[PDB]
Symmetry: D2
Subunit: 201 residues, 4 copies
C-alpha cells in the first residue's frame, strides 16, 4: 500500500523544488533507483502524443496518469515516458520506477481529475502569489525564447488555464504551503511525516 | 525548551476546534492538568481590563481590535513559558466584561498551542512561535459558523450578531488578521474537519514529545 | 437603432436588483406601452421542473442557482429578438407549480434594456449581446448577512436550513459559475445599491442614450 | 471644478486611461489656457529627500511606492486650491537628484480635474476632495507583465534588477497601502485603457458635466 501524495499549484510556485528538497532531505538521492523508497512523478512527463495551449487539461494523457498511478498502488513496476520541454517530443526511452513506499505526484492539474484526486491520501497545494510566480517563470524560461513571447504565452495560455482549471482545485487540498521551497518549516514538516511513514510509527 | 506553535485564522475558522482536537488525539485529556505535555492558550483570555468604555450595549466596543488585547502581557506570558517557568493565565467572562481574580495555573509544558485571531499581529510574539499555522476558512463559511455558534452558545439574537459582525468583526479581520496570513508556515484550508491536516500536526508533536 | 442592452450580474444579495430598480426610478420610467427603459430578470426564465425535480425542490435539494435551472435557449432567443427591435413575451414563472403560467408579460421594444441575473454573463452567446456589462461586487460575507436577514424577515425561513442550503448550493454555484464571469464585466460597481455615485453615473449615461 | 481620483496598482492603466479619456474629448486639440479637462499625476508630488533618505535612495533601499515618499501636505493644499478655482503651480520632480526643479507647471482652473496616483485614496483628507473615485483593477501578474516590458524599453536596466525591486518594494507597498484603499472607490474600471466601454462611460459623463 504505497502512500501517494499529490502536490499541486501554479507554475513556478515551487512544486518541483519542494518535492526535490523532500526527497533530498530523506536521502533518496543517494540510494539506487531500485531501492528508492520515495519517488517523484511529474505531470509534464505525461504529455499527450504530439499557438497551442499546453496548460490545458486536454494536453495531458489523463488515462496514462490514472493507469500508472493505479498500477503504482498495486505494487507493480511502471515505466514513465520522458518529455523535453523545448522540442515537445516524447522520446522512446522510458524511466523505470520500481515499487516505492511514498510517491510524490507534482502537477499544475494534479487535483483536476476526480479519479486522480481520490488516489492521494494527502493532498498538498503550493500557493504562491501570481506575480511572484510570474517573476520566477520569466527568469526560468529565458535561462532554460524571446522575452516578449514568454509574456505573450503566459498571458494568453498559462494565466487563463491556472484560473480556470488549477485555482478551483485548491479547495481539494489538505495542506497549503504558502511560499514553496523557501518554506523550510513546511518542508521539514512533510519530511518528518514521510520519514515517520517509513518507520511505521 | 518548549515548542511554541502559533495558530491564527479568522473568527469561527476552527482554531479552537483544531487545537482541542490536537490535544485530544494526543490523549492529554486523560493526563492530569499538572502533567499535561501539550497545553492550549487562547487569546480571548488576554483581553484588556474592563473600564475603557462602560457602554457596550448602548454603543458597542469593537473587541476584535488589537488595542483591546494585552499585547504586553501576551509577550510576557509567552516569554516566561519559553524560559520554562510556570505562568498564571487570567480568566475572563465575555458577558461580564471583567477580569476574574482567579487565575489558571499552567505548568511548563513541552508543546504550547496559542490560538488567536491576531496571534501573528505583533512581531515580538511572531518570532516566539517556532511553527506558525493559519486556518484559512472562507469568509461566508466563517460567518455561517459564527452565527450558529453565537445563537446556541450565547443568548444573542441574530440582528445584533450580524450588526456586530459587519461593523467590527469583518473590518478588523481584513485590516489586522488577513495581512498576517503571510507569516504562516502551514495553512489549514477548512479547519476541524480537515482530518489529514490535523493528523499531520499530531504526528509532528508526538515526534517532538519522544525527543 | 438597436436597443442598448446592459447586462448586470453579481452574486445573490449583492444589490443588482436594487441597483437596476434605483436606475429606472431615478429615470422616472416606472407606462409599459411607452416606457423607454425596462428591467429583465433572469428569475423569469426558470425552467419547468419535471416530476422528479419538483419532489427534490420540496425536500430543499434543488439548486436554483445552477445554470441547468435556467432556460438559456429562451434567454438567448428573447435577448436576440430584443436587439432586433421586436416585442417579446416573457414568462411569469409560477413557483408553486414550478411551471410557466398561461399569462405572460409583454415587453415592447425599449431604447435601453437591463438584464439582471446571477449567471447573466455565463453563456457566451448571451454575453456578446450586451453592449455594456455591469458586475455588482459585494463581499461574500456581506452578501450572506444580507440574504440571511432577507430570508428570515421577508420570507420567514429557518436559519439552519438557510445556512445549510447556502454552503451546499448557493456558495458553490457562485464560486463555480458566477465569479468566473466577473472578468467579462466592463464596469464593476461595488457595495451595491448604496453606491449612489456609480448609480448616478449609469443613470446619466442612459439619459444621454435617450437624448442622443 | 469636478475632481476625479484615479487609483490602482502600477501598470494597471491609470495613466493610459486618463490619457485616453482626455483624448476622446477635444482636450488634446484644445488650447492650454482653455483646457477644461486636465490630468494631474501623483508622481509630480514626490517629497524632496533628506540627505539620510537620499543616502538610502542611492543604495537602492528607498521604497518610492510608500506613502512617506509623497508630499501629502502639498497634494492636499494644491488640490484644495484647485477646488477653490485658483490657478495652481505643480512641481517638476527631478528623479536623479530627488529634488524639485525651479521650473513649475501652471495649471489653470479647469472644469474637470483628473488626479491619478497609486495612493490617491490613501489620505482621508485627499479622498474627500474627489467627487468621483475610480480604481483601475488589473491582475497583479498582468501588471507585472506590463511593467517588465515597459521598464526594459523605457529605461536601460536589466531584467533581474527589475524583478528584484518589484518583489522587494513595489509588491509589498501595493498590498499594504494601495490595495486597502480599493474599498473607497465608487467605480472600478478593469483591465485599464483596453476597456473601451468604461472609457466612453467616463468620457460621456465628463461631456455632460462640461455642458451643465
Ligand atoms: N421567487 N423567488 N425568488 C427566489 C430567489 O430570488 C431565487 C434565488 O436565485 O430563486 C427563487 N427561490 C429560491 C429558493 C427557493 O427555495 N425558492 C425560490 O423561489
Amino acid at each position: 500500500e504505497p502512500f501517494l501524495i499529490g502536490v499541486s499549484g501554479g507554475t513556478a510556485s515551487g512544486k518541483s523544488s519542494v518535492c526535490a528538497k523532500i526527497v533530498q532531505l530523506l536521502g533518496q538521492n543517494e540510494v539506487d533507483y531500485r531501492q528508492k523508497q520515495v519517488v517523484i512523478l511529474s505531470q509534464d512527463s505525461f504529455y499527450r502524443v504530439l499557438q497551442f495551449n499546453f496548460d490545458h487539461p486536454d494536453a495531458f494523457d489523463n488515462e496514462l496518469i490514472l493507469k500508472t498511478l493505479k498500477e503504482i498502488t498495486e505494487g507493480k513496476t511502471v515505466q514513465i515516458p520522458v518529455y523535453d520541454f523545448v522540442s515537445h517530443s516524447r522520446k522512446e526511452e522510458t524511466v523505470t520506477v520500481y515499487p516505492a513506499d511514498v510517491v510524490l505526484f507534482e502537477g499544475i492539474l494534479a487535483f483536476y481529475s476526480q479519479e486522480v484526486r481520490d488516489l492521494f491520501q494527502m493532498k498538498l497545494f503550493v500557493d504562491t502569489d501570481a506575480d511572484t510566480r510570474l517573476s520566477r517563470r520569466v527568469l526560468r524560461d529565458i535561462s532554460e525564447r524571446d522575452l516578449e513571447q514568454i509574456l505573450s504565452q503566459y498571458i494568453t495560455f498559462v494565466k487563463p488555464a491556472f484560473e480556470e482549471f488549477c485555482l478551483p482545485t485548491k479547495k481539494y487540498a489538505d495542506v497549503i504551503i504558502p511560499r514553496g521551497a523557501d518554506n523550510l518549516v513546511a518542508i521539514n514538516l512533510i519530511v518528518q511525516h514521510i520519514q515517520d511513514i517509513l518507520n511505521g510509527g
